[PDB]
Amino acid sequence: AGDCLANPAVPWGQGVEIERALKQVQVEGLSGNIKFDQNGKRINYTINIM
Amino acid sequence: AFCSQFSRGVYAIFGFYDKKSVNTITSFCGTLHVSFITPSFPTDGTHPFVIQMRPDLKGALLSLIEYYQWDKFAYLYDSDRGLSTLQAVLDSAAEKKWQV
Amino acid sequence: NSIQIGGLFPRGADQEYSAFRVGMVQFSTSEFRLTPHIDNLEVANSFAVTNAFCSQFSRGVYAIFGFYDKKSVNTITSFCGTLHVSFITPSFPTDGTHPFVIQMRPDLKGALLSLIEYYQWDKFAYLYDSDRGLSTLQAVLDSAAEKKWQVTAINVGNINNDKKDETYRSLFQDLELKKERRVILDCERDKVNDIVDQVITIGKHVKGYHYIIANLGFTDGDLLKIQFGGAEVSGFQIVDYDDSLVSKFIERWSTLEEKEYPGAHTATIKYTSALTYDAVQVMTEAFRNLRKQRIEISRRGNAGDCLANPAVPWGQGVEIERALKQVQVEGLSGNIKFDQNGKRINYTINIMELKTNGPRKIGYWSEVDKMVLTEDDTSGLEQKTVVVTTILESPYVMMKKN
Amino acid sequence: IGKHVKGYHYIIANLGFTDGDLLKIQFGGAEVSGFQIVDYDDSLVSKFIE
Numbered sequence: 184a185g186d187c188l189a190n191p192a193v194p195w196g197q198g199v200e201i202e203r204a205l206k207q208v209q210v211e212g213l214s215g216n217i218k219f220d221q222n223g224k225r226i227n228y229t230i231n232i233m
Numbered sequence: 234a235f236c237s238q239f240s241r242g243v244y245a246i247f248g249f250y251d252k253k254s255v256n257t258i259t260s261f262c263g264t265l266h267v268s269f270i271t272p273s274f275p276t277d278g279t280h281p282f283v284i285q286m287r288p289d290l291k292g293a294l295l296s297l298i299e300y301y302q303w304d305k306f307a308y309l310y311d312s313d314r315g316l317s318t319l320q321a322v323l324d325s326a327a328e329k330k331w332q333v
Numbered sequence: 334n335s336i337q338i339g340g341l342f343p344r345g346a347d348q349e350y351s352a353f354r355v356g357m358v359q360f361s362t363s364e365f366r367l368t369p370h371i372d373n374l375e376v377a378n379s380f381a382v383t384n385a386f387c388s389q390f391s392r393g394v395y396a397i398f399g400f401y402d403k404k405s406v407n408t409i410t411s412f413c414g415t416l417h418v419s420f421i422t423p424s425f426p427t428d429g430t431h432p433f434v435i436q437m438r439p440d441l442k443g444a445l446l447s448l449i450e451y452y453q454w455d456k457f458a459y460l461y462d463s464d465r466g467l468s469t470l471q472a473v474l475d476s477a478a479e480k481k482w483q484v485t486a487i488n489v490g491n492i493n494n495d496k497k498d499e500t501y502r503s504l505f506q507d508l509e510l511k512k513e514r515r516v517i518l519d520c521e522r523d524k525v526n527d528i529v530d531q532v533i534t535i536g537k538h539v540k541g542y543h544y545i546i547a548n549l550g551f552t553d554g555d556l557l558k559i560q561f562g563g564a565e566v567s568g569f570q571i572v573d574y575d576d577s578l579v580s581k582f583i584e585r586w587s588t589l590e591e592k593e594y595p596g597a598h599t600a601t602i603k604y605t606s607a608l609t610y611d612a613v614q615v616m617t618e619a620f621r622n623l624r625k626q627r628i629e630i631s632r633r634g635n636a637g638d639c640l641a642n643p644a645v646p647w648g649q650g651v652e653i654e655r656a657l658k659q660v661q662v663e664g665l666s667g668n669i670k671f672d673q674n675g676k677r678i679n680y681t682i683n684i685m686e687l688k689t690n691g692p693r694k695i696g697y698w699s700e701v702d703k704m705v706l707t708e709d710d711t712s713g714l715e716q717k718t719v720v721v722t723t724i725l726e727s728p729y730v731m732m733k734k735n
Numbered sequence: 736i737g738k739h740v741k742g743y744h745y746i747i748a749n750l751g752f753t754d755g756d757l758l759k760i761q762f763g764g765a766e767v768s769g770f771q772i773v774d775y776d777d778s779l780v781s782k783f784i785e
């Protein structure tokens with residue numbers, strides 16, 4: 184990928200698909216259900232009041 | 234460290250960030266298209282290529298104050314985990330007219 | 334003598350770059366010249382600042398002048414601390430004690446907390462933006478518990494420009510719940526004009542209200558449209574326009590052409606750009622004091638890549654800091670002096686009230702004298718006294734037992 | 736001079752109310768009454784304006 188200080192830095196193409204994979208991963212974990220919207224924020228989560 | 238993983242040809246980076254370094258992660262991720270997975274405090278806004286594992290606690294605290302029907306409380310905060318939850322109880326302090 | 338220096342200017346900062354050139358001409362000497370290597374980048378992007386900085390480091394710069402935003406300020410403070418590159422800036426003062434950073438902007442926090450104490454305020458509104466950081470906001474919050482105030486802080490930063498006219502009026506309808514008559518604007522000179530444009534639209538600038546613009550540029554924004562409403566408006570001014578040093582500056586500034594120097598054919602100057610001019614004098618008077626003290630700052634060669642591992646902090650850089658931080662010259666922003674950290678000290682922020690005849694200076698602030706009034710004469714109303722004659726005779730007019 | 740707040744009340748005494756700019760005294764608080772001879776809700780006017 185060369186030096187990060189590439190000028191102009193041209194982004195590698197295969198990286199944008201890795202986000203859509205991660206943000207669409209909907210599995211179960213220790214923190215309850217796990218889902219991300221288009222921003223990466225947690226949605227459909229459950230914070231328990233104690 | 235990010236430039237090391239970049240030249241080494243990684244596909245996704247899992248790490249953390251602090252209040253001071255969070256700008257560096259999100260900016261280099263948005264420019265070089267590197268996915269970042271993190272359990273740190275959620276970012277303040279829509280940052281690309283940021284997989285924030287930590288759920289947004291802001292609403293859960295605002296509702297817990299609303300549950301107990303508090304009107305005059307003390308909010309001790311540390312500058313460590315950011316102050317995203319601080320503005321939440323400050324911008325809502327005027328809507329619901331609290332005394333923080 | 335060509336002294337290679339780095340230059341980081343925001344893509345929008347046009348007047349700030351114009352002042353960076355006049356100091357180059359006024360402080361040029363046959364002893365040496367400065368060769369500015371200028372990078373026009375987006376100050377908000379931390380990646381662009383990074384390679385603009387890594388560009389200057391490999392090109393062998395002795396000092397870098399620029400601007401930082403609350404986002405990229407960590408990129409400047411962290412890179413300038415390892416590579417020992419000196420950084421000069423007019424942007425907002427930083428959070429704590431950082432090395433190799435010359436902050437031209439004096440600390441306004443102390444100056445603001447004194448003005449609230451003068452007006453004897455106890456319940457006001459603090460409309461702040463996250464642009465210049467909220468160190469000034471933490472200055473009124475930590476101090477809110479000590480003097481026991483009641484402040485309604487609203488984050489005015491998050492405002493969409495299409496729903497701006499709606500969210501602004503709806504904002505002051507929440508301040509109208511408290512019958513709020515005292516509002517503090519902690520914003521740059523640009524958001525002040527927008528808020529003011531909305532205050533007048535909903536007519537909350539009449540007799541009864543009272544505003545305080547919390548930035549070093551009171552007369553920067555257009556204050557002639559809230560000049561005739563009725564509300565008292567205060568603020569802070571760092572560029573004194575009655576000094577002979579600045580008067581000679583304005584005589585030369587106002588005569589330039591508006592083609593080559595954008596926004597220069599005016600009789601005013603912004604506080605951010607006024608620090609830029611004073612930043613050049615300090616840089617010239619720093620490398621001039623490095624010549625008089627006999628310190629070889631000529632680089633060994635190519636500094637290499639900024640990402641060097643382990644990073645080599647070339648030795649002559651730490652000396653450049655001690656030169657800059659020892660500069661004590663006189664310029665637009667009053668007496669210029671720094672401490673071992675880089676914060677401006679021995680400075681003077683003017684408190685300015687807005688009346689009918691225009692701006693009006695009422696005093697100043699020093700970190701050792703706090704606020705000090707000036708020219709208390711004359712009073713607004715010279716109330717005459719009435720002499721009432723009478724005769725002593727009971728029970729009409731008697732004297733008390735004490 | 737801020738005489739458009741809640742309490743004042745102006746009457747625009749000409750046949751063209753919506754002719755000049757009104758969006759500026761629209762939110763001050765004072766009431767502004769006027770007269771209009773060109774009704775923009777009539778079908779003859781809308782085919783004209785179109």
Ligand SMILES: *[C@@H]1O[C@H](CO)[C@@H](O)[C@H](O)[C@H]1NC(C)=O
Pocket residue numbers: 209216218227228
């Ligand atoms: C919403 O959250 C629930 C909670 O477990 C989960 O079962 C469901 O799959 C979530 N919805 C989507 C679309 O993932």
Ligand SMILES: *[C@@H]1O[C@H](CO)[C@@H](O)[C@H](O)[C@H]1NC(C)=O
Pocket residue numbers: 661668670679
């Ligand atoms: C502080 O500023 C004043 C301005 O009048 C000046 O007279 C004095 O010499 C300054 N002190 C130092 C140590 O520079």
